[PDB]
Amino acid sequence: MRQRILVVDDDASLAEMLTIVLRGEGFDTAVIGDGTQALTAVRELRPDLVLLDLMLPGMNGIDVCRVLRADSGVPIVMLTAKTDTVDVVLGLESGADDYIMKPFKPKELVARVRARL
Numbered sequence: 001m002r003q004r005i006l007v008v009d010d011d012a013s014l015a016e017m018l019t020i021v022l023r024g025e026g027f028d029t030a031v032i033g034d035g036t037q038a039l040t041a042v043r044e045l046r047p048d049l050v051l052l053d054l055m056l057p058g059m060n061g062i063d064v065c066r067v068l069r070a071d072s073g074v075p076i077v078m079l080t081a082k083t084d085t086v087d088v089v090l091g092l093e094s095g096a097d098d099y100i101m102k103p104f105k106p107k108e109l110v111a112r113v114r115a116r117l
């Protein structure tokens with residue numbers, strides 16, 4: 001079976017782009033736009049890696065990271081924008097393995113994803 005990446009971002013357009021690009025790189029993808037549905041998604045989907053937007057509707061990325069981190073050791077990479085008010089390092093401390101600045105070169109994102117797997 002191919003590796004699975006769960007994308008948790010409220011940016012539907014960006015998520016579609018990640019879907020296409022990641023799928024093009026040989027991965028399978030699933031998308032959720034809300035933090036509250038992340039735990040269930042992870043438990044059900046069983047993703048190899050989670051790409052997690054730091055600022056989300058419902059639960060925020062740091063909060064989501066904690067819950068996920070509590071459930072398992074699945075790798076989490078934060079997606080963060082320079083605009084974001086919350087500090088991404090806080091997310092790393094909550095257990096995320098890495099982070100990426102938005103917007104990004106898809107090529108760079110895939111590489112980092114491959115590196116944290």
Ligand SMILES: [Mg+2]
Nearest residue numbers: 010053055056
């Ligand atoms: Mg956002």
